[PDB]
Symmetry: C3
Subunit: 179 residues, 3 copies
């Protein structure tokens, strides 16, 4: 019965609606902008570094709340997409792949054809197969660009926050259907 | 040798060509229309309920003959897509996800961009993470809309029927190639 | 530090740059043309047989260096796509599926919609479910068309060659980014 579903959604809504300053502190520390799209799983934060690089970090809040984290760094001009695995318990990152794309658009465009273009191109060897010194220098480069414990903490806590907001909107949409 | 393949296809064809009333009885009982597309894996049945809802049920005959069953219910206006897992031996269903879409088209359009749109949006939490009473009321709602043992029986038997027809057409197409 | 990454890439480049006749011997023996697209994972070889068939063989060099090998055989006019699994150690092939498409374009076009079209159509039953004599005659047909130990050897060695070239180009692109 639609009434029975509606009653439970109504009571769950009231409860669910019932640390922002930690988000603001971390984002402002690195001069991040948060790109927030309510209704979608992916969250994005973007900043510009002292050396003129643009750093994008993408994560899937539903996957989190090992997770896939995409760090894209550009200097139109070439960008490297680092696909990372983040340990949710440890707050640690591991490089899975690093792919040099000819532009930020090539790295990030969500169109069907842009995805196919990414699928077809070489993504570098398994990271574990690289020279150890190459592995290390790339990890230290990412670290120096803010891929660290503070970022992992933000990703975890912001994912918990956004997903709960997504859950609330979902409850609301369900309520409208079952009304 | 092409002749050797052709001989075996020819003999398999003759054998394979060598309960419809149960299909008709179940479909008519619920006032279903069957949407049958020969050559394709997916089968669709659709009906309108006493309360003016439209219920679509989709299943993949090749997967069946746990299976994925998509039940889409609409009232242009919002639709909820219930993604179910069906126990093939038991004839039982389990809710994996329920996603409210803003229209039937958004839920069902097979275009590349429509699929991408579905992939990007929030699909609700894991069903197991919902309040137990919410889980139950949604399951009972689906039951009341004909997601039951009779539907599971139809899905199993119709999948066996259609797949065998697909196998026959496949044999025929192979025969033409090897001629 | 970008300098530290650049140094290691520079030294790896110098080392990596530091049997072609076996490629030429096998390709020429079967009158293959190699279709080589630097920067992409997939390699393609294509020939025309004595009976006027066109045989395409596709493989993913990154997957190789069990691998997926697609053998497409045409006579505009219908083509059968054989999806094979190749044992990398044994140099042996196993048929996973054989799908008759109405044209080479339908079988091979890489567009988003062409992929969706392939995903939706019936792919024949599990190969293991076929009559044993049908399984055998299809395997012997592929053999007679050059799906053999020589082809497996080429696929393995050419995959090693191309992937290393892809690795070199990747190092070069990384060098440019970190400069």
């Amino acid at each position: 019965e639609t009434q029975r579903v509606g009653d439970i959604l109504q009571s769950e809504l009231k409860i669910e609606k019932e640390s922002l300053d930690s988000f603001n502190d971390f984002l402002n520390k690195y001069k991040f902008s948060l790109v927030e799209t309510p209704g979608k799983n992916e969250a994005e934060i973007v900043r510009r570094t002292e050396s003129g690089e643009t750093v994008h970090v993408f994560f899937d809040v539903a996957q989190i709340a090992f997770a896939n984290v995409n760090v894209v760094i550009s200097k139109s001009e070439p960008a490297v997409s680092f696909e990372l695995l983040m340990n949710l318990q440890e707050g640690s990152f591991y490089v899975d792949s690093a792919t040099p794309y000819p532009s930020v658009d090539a790295a990030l465009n969500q169109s069907a054809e842009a995805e196919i273009t990414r699928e077809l191109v070489y993504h570098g060897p398994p990271f574990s197969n690289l020279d150890e010194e190459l592995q290390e220098s790339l990890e230290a480069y990412l670290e120096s660009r803010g891929v660290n414990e503070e970022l992992a903490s933000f990703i975890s806590a912001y994912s918990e926050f956004k997903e709960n907001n997504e859950y609330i909107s979902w409850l609301e949409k369900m309520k409208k259907f079952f009304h």
